[PDB]
Design a protein around this ligand. Sequence first.
Ligand SMILES: OC[C@H]1O[C@@](CO)(O[C@H]2O[C@H](CO)[C@@H](O)[C@H](O)[C@H]2O)[C@@H](O)[C@@H]1O
Ligand SMILES: OC[C@H]1O[C@@](CO)(O[C@H]2O[C@H](CO)[C@@H](O)[C@H](O)[C@H]2O)[C@@H](O)[C@@H]1O
Ligand SMILES: OC[C@H]1O[C@@](CO)(O[C@H]2O[C@H](CO)[C@@H](O)[C@H](O)[C@H]2O)[C@@H](O)[C@@H]1O
Ligand SMILES: [Cl-]
Ligand SMILES: [Cl-]
Lengths: 298, 300
Amino acid sequence: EIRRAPVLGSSMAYRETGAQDAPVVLFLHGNPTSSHIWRNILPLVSPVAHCIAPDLIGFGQSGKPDIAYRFFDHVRYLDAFIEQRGVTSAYLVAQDWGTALAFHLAARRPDFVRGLAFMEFIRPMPTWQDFHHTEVAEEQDHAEAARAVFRKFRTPGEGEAMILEANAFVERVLPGGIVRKLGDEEMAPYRTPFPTPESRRPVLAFPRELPIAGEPADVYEALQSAHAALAASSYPKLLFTGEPGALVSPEFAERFAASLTRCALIRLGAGLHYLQEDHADAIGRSVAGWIAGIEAVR
Amino acid sequence: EIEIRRAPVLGSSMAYRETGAQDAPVVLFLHGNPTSSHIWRNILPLVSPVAHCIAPDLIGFGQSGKPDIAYRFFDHVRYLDAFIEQRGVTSAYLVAQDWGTALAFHLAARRPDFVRGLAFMEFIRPMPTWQDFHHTEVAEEQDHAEAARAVFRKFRTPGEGEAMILEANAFVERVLPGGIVRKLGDEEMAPYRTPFPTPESRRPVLAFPRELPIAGEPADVYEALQSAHAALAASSYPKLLFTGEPGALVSPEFAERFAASLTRCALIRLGAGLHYLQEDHADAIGRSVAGWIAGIEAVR
Ligand SMILES: OC[C@H]1O[C@@](CO)(O[C@H]2O[C@H](CO)[C@@H](O)[C@H](O)[C@H]2O)[C@@H](O)[C@@H]1O
Ligand SMILES: OC[C@H]1O[C@@](CO)(O[C@H]2O[C@H](CO)[C@@H](O)[C@H](O)[C@H]2O)[C@@H](O)[C@@H]1O
Ligand SMILES: OC[C@H]1O[C@@](CO)(O[C@H]2O[C@H](CO)[C@@H](O)[C@H](O)[C@H]2O)[C@@H](O)[C@@H]1O
Ligand SMILES: [Cl-]
Ligand SMILES: [Cl-]
């Protein structure tokens, strides 16, 4: 069921399933997706949880206010959505920019977080080498092409042409990070939120928010702080990795998980950035088991 | 990844598959009739990242020894207990199907301090009448359920079961594929046959249906499993029950009421499946179990 909540004088669409008398799980998408990306995962988790999957402001079926769509704008709208829905605590399941939102939420409200399941996550990246980082000789080529594209996204004029005019994030980056080829009916709901250049403003804003080489400084610092909190947190964590992944290499995932407390690491196999589309059943089954286990003993 | 090893047990030996970090919690995987640790082969790789996985072949099954014993349920209890002691396992998760669940329930009733959690499916319970065997509320399942009762009544009949199971190898050749929705590949089916090259080698396979707790017979097993089920109902350790549609020993409707009656039991619905759920749902079961263990161990 796909519903709409009034949020800050605009609205956010969201998908909801499960008995609403169970622990809440918030599913947080990133760029350039929507709650659509969780569509095959939700039915596997709904038997054990009240699943809520919002569309970020300016994404999916959410409102399109005339705002900057910076990371901190998303923070405000997501906070307001959570308040409006009356959610007092939740598990968080996140990918891409959803992870930055999840990390920042957890840092500000540690009492809120029952657990964090995450994948293909954002972290401060001191150099461009740390974006699509990997130590695997065969992957060096793919990594450099990603770097080259996102450098252009973050270049004035060039990013506008690519994303606003040519729709490169939806038409190229999205399919580029899915191993399988989506059916027409699966791809179409990724296109429908973004019919015009103006509508694509949020999709351009996001790569310009990535914390790379100190910029943008405010996001970089916020995410450094959020990551410090995560490393100091004691709630359960579940990290998924694909092979070779994109933002998170399998070897990095192992090191990162070991750098936290109470972080399990689940290996999904062949995958790139949008792991949900290649591994929905594995993700859903894993998350559901994990919530069941936590709730049994917490 | 996965090594196959052998342990000396009570003068004989049990084979077992082992994979995972030796500093992780132990998970014991327990097969039933007429299978072996082979049935866990596609589940083990999904749990080994979070746990030290140990999957024994029951005495007289798979690559385990074939001592001259009756292969009654209590014989299996003794050999499994002895295996656990020999490997020096002091606590474990249990993952079980079929007679594996009877063994797990009986172990948990005697040594609840040993059980970190129980994940189970298509399990054995005391069945006061034949109608409780392959019980279905569903009109369109009734004939198939009746056929199953007729087959197992024959297995339990002196002379008849011998002809069917020892001579015709019906448990391996018919009952097993009968309880799998997909068709197994030749290479997947062959390791189910190799433990049982002769009629006499099939004695443990004939022994099991004759141990099923149905209408009070055999009395010792019926009593033991009544007691084990009482303990399960009162138990406080985490549980995970998987169900297929329609299943075989456990109907979806029965599963839902059963899980809801227990303490700390989650129910995981797998979709189309019969008795040998691992073969149709290895990935779903493995991912579920791994997530569940990871969650529990994160909270202590
Ligand atoms: O052990 C299973 C699984 O649990 C995790 C957290 O989900 O780690 C917990 O258990 C480990 C083994 O006992 C401990 O070493 C660890 O401190 C604890 O958090 C995963 O890391 C592990 O794979
Ligand atoms: O879930 C596996 C994941 O957990 C980590 C800690 O983040 O290690 C745990 O699990 C290992 C595998 O069983 C144990 O050997 C280890 O002692 C335990 O802390 C990661 O190393 C691993 O990727
Ligand atoms: O809650 C999800 C899942 O957890 C289980 C046990 O695995 O139940 C636990 O959580 C419930 C909600 O917090 C509690 O009411 C219950 O007592 C606790 O065991 C499953 O039953 C449930 O589906
Ligand atoms: Cl981005
Ligand atoms: Cl049997």
